[PDB]
Design brief:
Two copies of one chain form a homodimer.
Chain A (H helix, E strand, L loop, with lengths): L6 H11 L9 H20 L10 H23 L6 E5 L2 E4 H5 L4 H18 L3 H14 L7 H22 L3 H30 L2
Antiparallel strand pairs in A: 1-2
Helix pairs in contact in A: 1-7, 2-3, 3-5, 3-6, 3-8, 5-8, 6-7, 7-8
Bound molecules: ligand JJ3 (2 copies).
Amino acid sequence: LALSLTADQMVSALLDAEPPILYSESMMGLLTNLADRELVHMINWAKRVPGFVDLTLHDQVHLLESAWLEILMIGLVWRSMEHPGKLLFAPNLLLDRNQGKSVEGMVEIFDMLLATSSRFRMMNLQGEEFVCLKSIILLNSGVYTFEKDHIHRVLDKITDTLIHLMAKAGLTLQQQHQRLAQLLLILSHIRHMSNKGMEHLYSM
Amino acid sequence: LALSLTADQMVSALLDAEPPILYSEPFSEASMMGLLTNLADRELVHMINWAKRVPGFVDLTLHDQVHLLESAWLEILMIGLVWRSMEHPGKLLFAPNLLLDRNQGKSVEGMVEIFDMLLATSSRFRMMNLQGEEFVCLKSIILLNSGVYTKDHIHRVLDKITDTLIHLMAKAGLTLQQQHQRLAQLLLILSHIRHMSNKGMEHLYSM
Ligand SMILES: COCc1cc(O)cc2c1O[C@@H](c1ccc(O)cc1)[C@H]1CCC[C@@H]21
Ligand SMILES: COCc1cc(O)cc2c1O[C@@H](c1ccc(O)cc1)[C@H]1CCC[C@@H]21
């Protein structure tokens, strides 16, 4: 199972499962087109998430319907870290705050996205950490609105992994749990952005 | 000065700051909505007082104090609700003289879903053996984290609360591994309370 993998194997597995950075092929049409092409990859990525495929098809689908937008958003935020003030939706679709105002109600979400991006930059989020957070989001957003014990052992597994990475990075015990906490609190914001995002979508 | 408190002082200050449990005054969609809102308005007053006793909160500008309370008040009301609904399986203790089960949620249009979410969370708390000391720490984190990205001072209090939480677990006898694992389970649930607050605002803003 996934419960038997070591911290290094979990990370290595997660890294190798990573989806590719897709390209942007009226504003909304590009984002939905890009988002929809991204969705196909997400699914195949989910199946590579240790612990995921051990669930019933119904649960696998419930977990994806629940977190797909948070997942797209954390990926968006991730590739935007080295472009302060901008959101890199795709290598050929990097938009800034002003371009957001273009669509109705999008400036509020952009600012939250940029803010979450600064936070990651300010924190120096590592790629190894990032893939862990993304998996935690997958297994955690639909888990309370549903197996369950399995999901919780896997989440503890990823937590161990996260801590393991910090230990190796050289952080002290106290820094380790302080960072884990900071990283996890950010998921609340991502959850919040996803909710706003859904509202913005449903109104179209 | 709040950044100078020890894990034990932090706990004491938080438990002392705790606001009181209020009482409410078949239900129709109209009266039930009035009972809940009346209770909420009265609770909000004590929350603001409680907010001011949260280490580092008053050190913030008035504009930031208002932003934090404005974005987190429902999450705070709901975590309090979930907390006092632990011992009452399948029910929500909005107040002693107001314990509603899921069926009394259908009374209001589209509230039964918020109800199921709230109840599930209550189960998770019960299931996790959530302790009052841990509970006051989460509530505080909720307050300070809800609008922090929409600052340096705020993150130190948070780190202070993280250490307290761990401290509480260490004393309880959990191994280092169990400490980090429990810390995560607790924090991942704030993600769900956030969602509930969000669906809650939608429902409230809907009428
Ligand atoms: C960004 O504002 C949220 C947002 C608001 C909205 O009304 C519509 C959309 C939004 O994010 C876009 C997105 C595209 C690619 C990504 O990697 C992430 C998100 C797509 C996702 C679904 C429709 C469209
Ligand atoms: C199902 O609750 C969501 C909910 C939906 C809604 O449309 C209206 C309300 C709700 O929660 C109630 C609540 C009252 C006391 C508490 O301790 C916690 C929540 C109050 C809070 C603001 C208006 C009312």
